[PDB]
Symmetry: D2
Subunit: 307 residues, 4 copies
């Protein structure tokens, strides 16, 4: 039962699924849906109202075509931006989406004080750093980072070791994308570190086999439906609710922070999600922390190449 | 609720995939079977919803197939397959789609509840019922969404909470679906009395027009309804498998006085057995129901 | 979810359990707790507020020592021979009703006091058009019966349907025509699988279980608290679930009487006598005549 | 959540039965063992709780026992407090024998189980059981978990803010000495001091702490015992552990505190498969009070036998 308002910037497949999740799963009361496409946010709103009627959930929804109409939002999830084309470099996408994130931030800044901005737009860590510059102290800027990569990794462990999903813990950290890495020291099954759980059950599964299965599963979703829709919508709800309901759940998110020897970079580490956000680098071992620093340097390199 | 049963989803396009997601993230169901003829589609939907179940910490089992013949021992089967034109032409093309699905599911799914979503839904319900017979229970979504869409309209126009509204849309799903105004109440007070005592100054006609304008806005923007229908499948399937005995208007093959056996929508008890309650309608609503029942039979007779 | 106020008159084991249920499961916006014992309702409220904090549920609870303090509630739950107990409890129920009647317009009154059918009629007489009066009737009996079926037939609870109807107490009867297992009539299910279990063994099992609860706990608590919550929420959220409850209705050959039949629980309450076969309707008529005999003896 | 694991409830008095009712009617757990030495007591509770499951349409499996040795393959074991039945050192010595006997009878048939201790003094009783169970499972105490939720509820009631808006921890040694970690207390992310200051609210830290104490005195005075709050906390801790939720809750957990050594103390802890105490969440001043709270617990523990 939370009396706050959550705004959705871009009500495409991911945006609309996220809005549906908020409507039917316990938690949220007020919603703001925004999309540039005329009539799209309105239609997505009317359908979700019918679904709330089914679950007998009393919700209040507003739909607009202009981002400037968003005011007094407690959480703002941004799915807007252009997808990465096969030809484009990570620098080319950063340049295209940097202006998009800047223009959205500029229109929301003054009307939404104290709001948690959740950037989904890619490259997610670089985009979080762009929105964080624009917003500053007027709110809290975060990115989804490796939050979904973490749930996809746990789901592959659960499948490969024949254990229920509830039994698996562990995090995917660093730079979201192809370079995101498993923090193997945090990976447990019913609280038993994964190396001991495997050898004690004669399981013929290696770390490389788990990592390839995650990539293969992600690629099968991309090939058949064009993008991941259901998993990311669930993760935004988990991030937003943990923040607004002060749940203090550990979730890796892209968060601007001071990284030893690298500086202020948005990178994913296991973070406490509550009223305030607290990154816990100490949950990573000395080796994993050294790899996290390389990720932060890579993120900054892309950020400093923005024209 | 927490039930140990398996639900199959035949057709994992936008609607079926939303239903599968709903099952993965809300309490109730933990076993599901996803089917789609399009290569890799059902598998893709399955891997993605498993990622959402991991977020919600819900231990579920999902299987995905490309052949409907692989569905076995399902307790409920939601059918979203078929073409999305007149009611007669749509009936002939989709009747054969439903008959084929029926023949491949019948023997390997004993006692399963079949939920026909394929349009014209009352007609497709009759088609499957003939194929399935006594080997399972066949129903259609009928006017269940129409009902919630109407309540959503009343809640918004009267500025009352959604949980305060009761009432049913009945008959033939589509343009001839009608509000059973005798059943429409606000916190147990008949709607006419509620509006008059409070000087709300809204006509039954303005509410009905509002429903149509809202429905039109959904089509022009996303092509079809998605979220509302998926929520209704969850409601129906769970009320049946958990023996909840909720009253929901659904398309049910029933004997209609002076018409015969026809699948038409009336407020129905949704439990292990399904029981239509024509007596919830007044004399005049019952005459219109007989007329809707004839209209469905006519379309059925044209296949 | 539900923006209404529910009052609980009497916060003993049952009442306090019901209050806890409303706070942690469906989520209620407002709760009013009443108990004549000084400090009792107040302490239950403080403890339940701590449970709401654990579950991160926004609830607002008020506690009183006098029934006259209950105002604007949307639902109100009211927690030797059966003839003499009727004369004694009729005055208690009339006094509670007189205190609440004009301060709680449109409220659903839920009578738990025994004899529940007779008490439902007595409170209905006081309230009249100022709210809706119902009694718990055979709602718990139905869920107790289903749990016995699930146990003896080794089937999940969710597979069982069926109703216990009539007069709450020794005379309540199973409407066996409504009893199904995954929609299969219980007689057919048992035959097809060769289960050596009789209707008589099931009815006796139900009684032995209830006697064992009284012997160990002193009273039934968890089942009743769950049942009150199910009834109140179905009425306030217009869920239209079928639950047998004591409802003042017209019975053929009897007239006005509160008796238990499978009833539609929504904004309006619709009793469904036609779910019963002819023989069950004839036993039901006998239950209604016995209730009316008791009602007529207490004005 | 939807977990396939089994939770055992040792002692099915008011608290035990309430915890078993919570598991039965809310999503998460569907398998439970109820244990009570009083003949027919656990059975009666089970039968009544099964009736509540029928109402909520939750297919659950419950087993009732009179003997503790009958508990097998439990993933979580909640040892509820017995009858209060006088002096501090003597109570700790008499209760330690009770906890040791229960531990000895559960250890071998419940490998890797989480043991939840309620029996006072909770911190010392968590250490006593930890010695018994050892590597065969994970031993925790309730510590200041409920004290934290009671403190949060008082902040909510006094400042007139939604309960969901309040963050903050009560830490140290459970009881009279339990102290508020004021540096962790926030309202929608804003520190309580700055929140109260900017809105000119006539509420001090002393008034809040006094209110929490007064409220807990009114529960004891009327109900005789806290029931609903503790039962809700067991559900929260057990589900966070069994579903690897990683919620931060202060619990009594054996750990190393410099200057003290091995001690069970309540610090904000990650509740997951593994439990990790987060002492760094407290500031320099709260950390020195905690080291002093640890010395007190360690001194009572070193007085046993
Ligand atoms: Cl729009
Ligand atoms: Cl296949
Ligand atoms: Cl059609
Ligand atoms: Tb490449
Ligand atoms: Tb690449
Ligand atoms: Tb590389
Ligand atoms: Tb080192
Ligand atoms: Tb034609
Ligand atoms: Tb035929
Ligand atoms: Tb037409
Ligand atoms: Tb008038
Ligand atoms: Tb007054
Ligand atoms: Tb007798
Ligand atoms: Tb008799
Ligand atoms: Tb006859
Ligand atoms: Tb002594
Ligand atoms: Tb003292
Ligand atoms: Tb002191
Ligand atoms: Tb000092
Ligand atoms: Tb000795």
């Amino acid at each position: 039962r939370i009396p706050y308002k959550v705004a959705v910037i871009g009500t495409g497949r991911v945006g609309a699924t996220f809005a549906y999740t908020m409507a039917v799963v316990p938690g949220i009361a007020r919603m703001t849906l925004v999309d540039v496409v005329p009539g799209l946010a309105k239609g997505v709103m009317e359908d979700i109202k019918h679904a709330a009627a089914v679950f007998r959930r009393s919700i209040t929804v507003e739909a607009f075509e202009d981002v400037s109409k968003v005011e007094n939002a407690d959480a703002i999830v941004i799915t807007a931006g252009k997808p990465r084309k096969a030809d484009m470099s990570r620098r080319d996408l950063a340049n295209v989406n940097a202006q998009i994130i800047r223009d959205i931030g500029d229109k929301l800044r003054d009307r939404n004080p104290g709001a948690l901005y959740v950037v989904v737009t890619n490259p997610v860590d670089v985009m979080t750093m762009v929105l964080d510059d624009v917003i500053g102290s007027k709110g809290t800027v975060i990115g989804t980072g490796t939050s979904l990569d973490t749930f996809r990794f746990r789901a592959a462990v659960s499948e490969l070791l024949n254990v229920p999903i509830v039994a698996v813990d562990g995090y995917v950290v660093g730079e979201h994308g192809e370079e995101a890495f498993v923090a193997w020291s945090t990976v447990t099954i019913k609280g038993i570190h994964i190396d001991q759980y495997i050898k004690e059950r004669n399981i013929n599964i290696s770390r490389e086999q788990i990592e390839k299965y995650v990539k293969d599963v992600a690629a099968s979703i991309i090939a058949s439906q064009g993008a991941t829709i259901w998993g990311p919508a669930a993760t935004f709800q988990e991030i937003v609710v943990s923040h607004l309901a002060n749940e203090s759940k550990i979730i890796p998110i892209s968060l601007p922070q001071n990284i030893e020897g690298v500086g202020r970079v948005a990178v994913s580490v296991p973070t406490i999600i509550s009223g305030r956000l607290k990154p816990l680098v100490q949950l990573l071992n000395e080796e994993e922390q050294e790899r996290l620093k390389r990720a932060a340097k890579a993120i900054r390199n892309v950020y400093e190449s923005i024209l």
